[model samples]
Target: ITGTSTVGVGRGVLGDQKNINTTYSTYYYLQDNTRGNGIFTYDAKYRTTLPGSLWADADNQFFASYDAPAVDAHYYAGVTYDYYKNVHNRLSYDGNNAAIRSSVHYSQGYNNAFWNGSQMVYGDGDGQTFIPLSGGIDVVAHELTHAVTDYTAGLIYQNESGAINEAISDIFGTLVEFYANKNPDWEIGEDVYTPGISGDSLRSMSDPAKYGDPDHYSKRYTGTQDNGGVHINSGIINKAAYLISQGGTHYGVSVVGIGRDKLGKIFYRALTQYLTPTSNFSQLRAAAVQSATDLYGSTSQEVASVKQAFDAVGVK
Candidate 1:
């Protein structure tokens, strides 16, 4: 929609007050023109038509319970965008300032969210397993990071490559959480998952095995389910990433902490410069090693720690 860029106040899925960028053309639409081409959020109306309708508000103040998912999706997309631009010097997901888009309330009792190659989609959840997928910042960033991977490494969504893809999303998703400085944790989707239950998350990067995911290459799932255990096998990579950032000893292998910023830089560089579609776990280890070497030199602790992290997870 064509209109003057404006700001609107809204309450997110978690009932937190926040501001969202809006467009005013008779009605305020959840079309943020402040970043990139724009960040447009839509309402799926419990149906699966996709990018449903550009959410519009009569007063430019979104406070209705139904508006929660949209508020978070829109706001978080902007945050993800900012993360890429500010931290990585990359534009939008494509490094071209591509307009970010999302749709909320996708289906009744839906329990997932994803980036459909072109845009983001969120499910309101069954109210037990989840509240709204977009309510979790890490969830939002995780899906959006798929777009970034698609445009960068183009990692195939199958087998080891796919596991790497999922791990990268989890990696950056957590990084973005820390970047926002909002109760950040290495846990994924704790905010929106299992509301009635406490101290649980969809997955744990710090300890992938906490949720039955393998934390070591030797323990990787070899079955054909879950896209050749793409989601399940990603645990190995996620654990390596956790060890890289926070440092830990696993299987008697120790990694010195390098902090989140360096962790992100090393991976971002690898994703954009080296990783390929068919890269496997060993290749990912190589990519991270080379990326760290490029950023901090062959003799730097960053490079040594990268090797140690992957070794700790049995990747090498």
Candidate 2:
């Protein structure tokens, strides 16, 4: 796609109309060169094949029902890139302006999306379960945050490390949601979860137990499934993060709420500067505390809130 960069009009899943950066040649391809290296989206053609063929539209307009996922996938990746660059001053997931690539319509009835270590892949869930994963910016950011985690902390995908990694994605996912100012809430996958159930979400950071996820360290699941409960145990950290940002009392522990920006800064610092591949919950607490101290000083309320949030979640 070495043609002039242009903007294309499209409607995303949920019928939201937006413009996306595209490259124009004989046909419009989903190659956005406006940001970093570029943002590319491909059509998976209902198969498990990787970044499939580069999506091509006869015109520079994308409005068909089948084009919805590609539109959102391409647009939201740009938004996530802008969020990192503007908010965190990071260029891209790799902090090196790496090109972001995504593929949609991965498989029929596919219900999940992932980073795949190389590029993003989204499944067009069975209509009852999900419309299209790219429909939710939070879900997209959540998956892309895995790329950030892999590039930075390289946190192992099992046990406590895995839980931390998952929580990091949820944290930044929520942050990116807020950054986009799109019906912002501290819930994960609310926009793309159950369509039949009104006001339901996959997980709640404000109160993870709403979905049976442990909101405390003592309630941590040690089951063999889910990579030793990576997704389940992330609730502990997610709750701590929510408490740190919004402030609340949990299990007799009180945390003074800091705003979202500071919360993001502290965590970004921890993820980038301190966390290692094998870091555990206690280690994560230490990293957050030290990150807060590094940014806001040892006696700062930010530091104290980090400690209180971890303590509230029983991470100590």
Candidate 3:
């Protein structure tokens, strides 16, 4: 009761781990019970959001405008930390015990969430159409990923560089979500909103075609929106990573097997070691193939599948 513990939300209630003695929902309940209560709690817990205010802006009382800032932000940060540890063998955010900090309740009735170079910021919701925006692991991971991309690729954040930068973030963001076993869908912003009006997500790995907006990348892609449409065009590379790791279709048909672990390692190696800020599609393909070949042998199916998947995505 006096120390930090782990708890999860289930059926609107918090269930504590036997070894740990803290209730997760209790804090949420207390915060909801009173807006901006204790000073110390205000410093720590109040950083998130008060309950009724979760939808306070414009009759945003419930589904359409609620904010689960703590749950999603904590879950995503944990997943990202674990992913870098297990996959890349890195110790922490910066490999030197860099403390990760995130902020919720960013703007009153604001609608977008993003990483502001040093920290993650989130909006409460629009009331009429949006929610807190930090509720999804993919969303949180996406923001954190921008940090990773900056640290590594340092991609210029424009044109092909920007597209690759965005792609790298989405790829890892989706990977973190799957790694956490959270619904396992390729859609990006699903958790931020309830099922109604376009709750689909920010992007679709299986089919980037759904958004219908021409600026977004399609099977026949050409980057052209937000800073080379980094967010939009990321679908191509994202799908390629998914295909290579999952290993199912080899194009139109012809099945192939390229173990997930092997593929993940190859991509990780290439992304961290081989690529640079200005690297493009072709360069990425080559780097991935090289990494895969080095790890699993030149003739190994992992290498072959990686190259083939890249080809399918028109990486060449």
Could you give candidate 2's per-residue lDDT for residues 1-316 as a string of tens digits? Answer: 7898989999999899999899988899999999999999999999998989999998888899999999999999988898889989999999999999999999899989999989999999887888799999999999889999999999999999999999999999999999899799999988888788889888899999999999999999998999999999999999999999999999999999998999999999999999999999999999999999999999999999999999999998
Q: What is the TM-score of each candidate against the true structure?
A: 0.99, 0.99, 0.74
lDDT of 1 by residue, 1-316 (tens): 9999999998999999999999999999999998999999999999999889999999999999999999999999999999999999999999899989999999899999998999999999999999999999999999999999999999999999999999999999999999999999999999999999999999999999999999998898988898988888888999998898899889999899999999999999999999999999999999999999989999999999999999898877
The number of clashing residue pairs in each candidate reads 0, 0, 0
Residue 281 lDDT, candidate 1, scale 0-100: 95
Give the per-residue lDDT digits (tens) of candidate 3, residues 25-140. Answer: 33422112111111011112234332112111122111211234544454456667778777788655455545555666665777777767766667656654456665677777
Clashing pairs in 2: none
Please list the residue runs of candidate 2 whose C-alpha ends up more than 4 Å from where it truly belongs after superposition: none
Winner of 1 and 3 under TM-score: 1
TM-score of 3: 0.74
lDDT of each: 0.94, 0.94, 0.59
